[PDB]
């Protein structure tokens, strides 16, 4: 308070590289079976979580406090996302459906309906008036959330699809598949504009763009992550210490305090690495089952991860970096 808040710290000459300090603050439990996929509302209030048991549940972001379940879905759900204004979630289910919510009413809007086999993952676009799912029917189909109708269906996979995501303007979506390819579409055309693959094209478990747009962080089942410059066709980062030869674990990028990049793992265990440098830096020790996803708080040094059956819960972590 007062004139001794402005208090000189120090110079130094030769900077130390931070590491995070992540520490368990909550327990979220509730879900009666595995875990699938648990995200932040991009305003940062809310944490939106699907499960194995056909239901989705809405919790604090900052409390960890049990808000609302959500249900509908006839069947096990694979995936959730927001809307950029966090009023809409869509899940994607088992069901080969994709429903759209009400968040502050728990009210079903839409079924999306199209897809010949289960649904595994959806996102918004930015501007929220398109939703991309993919399927084990190997298709990515785009939606218009006001109708509901499929706009277009891309022949995109050979084997279940196992992510999509939009990048920063929506302009472009990103598809990955157990058969090995991760694939770049222009959202408007529906054209693969690029198709990368990893060589011995592992199964490809999970993909997302960089916030910035320019690149795109690749999940393969030899235990690997992989930062690429998609446009350039070249791999600019390994990341490598975690367990992943089986199921599709989300990754994130953490830029709220240090770089990180930020996954699950099938050792139960969180990993974080320094993006640059590729070091792991801290690993998060309490989850009892594969570590299934992992999500990055909008503003805040806030990790969400969850996890599979053995033992369903959600967990909130912070650090002070």
């Given at each position: 308070s007062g004139r001794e808040n402005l208090y000189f710290q120090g110079t130094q000459s030769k900077p130390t590289p931070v590491k995070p300090n992540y520490a368990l603050k909550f327990t979220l439990a509730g879900h009666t079976k595995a875990v699938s996929s648990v995200k932040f509302s991009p305003n940062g209030e809310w944490l939106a979580s699907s499960s194995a048991d056909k239901l989705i549940k809405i919790w604090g972001a900052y409390d960890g406090k049990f808000e609302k379940t959500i249900s509908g879905h006839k069947l096990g759900i694979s995936d959730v996302a927001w809307s950029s204004d966090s009023n809409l979630l869509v899940s994607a289910s088992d069901d080969?459906?994709?429903?759209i919510w009400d968040v502050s009413s728990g009210k079903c809007l839409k079924t999306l309906k199209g897809h010949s086999n289960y649904v595994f993952c959806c996102n918004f676009n930015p501007q929220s008036n398109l939703i991309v799912s993919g399927s084990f029917d190997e298709s990515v189909r785009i939606w218009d959330v006001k109708t509901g109708k499929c706009l277009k269906t891309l022949p995109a996979h050979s084997d279940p699809v196992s992510a999509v995501h939009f990048n920063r303007d929506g302009s472009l979506i990103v598809s990955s598949s157990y058969d090995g390819l991760?694939?770049?579409?222009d959202t408007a055309s529906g054209q693969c504009l690029?198709?990368?693959?990893?060589?011995?094209?592992?199964?490809?478990?999970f993909v997302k763009f960089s916030p910035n747009g320019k690149y795109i962080l690749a999940a393969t089942l030899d235990n690997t992550l992989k930062l690429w410059d998609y446009s350039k066709?070249?791999?600019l980062k390994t990341y490598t210490g975690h367990k992943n030869e089986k199921y599709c674990i989300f990754a994130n990028f953490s830029v709220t305090g240090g770089k990180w990049i930020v996954s699950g793992s099938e050792d139960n265990l969180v990993y974080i690495w320094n993006l640059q440098t590729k070091e792991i830096v801290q690993k998060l020790q309490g989850h009892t089952d594969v570590v299934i996803s992992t999500a990055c708080h909008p503003t805040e040094n806030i990790i969400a991860s969850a996890a599979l059956e053995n033992d369903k819960t959600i967990k909130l972590w912070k650090s002070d970096c």
């Open positions: 080969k459906t994709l429903k991760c694939r770049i579409w690029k198709t990368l693959i990893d060589d011995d094209n592992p199964p490809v478990s066709g070249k791999c």
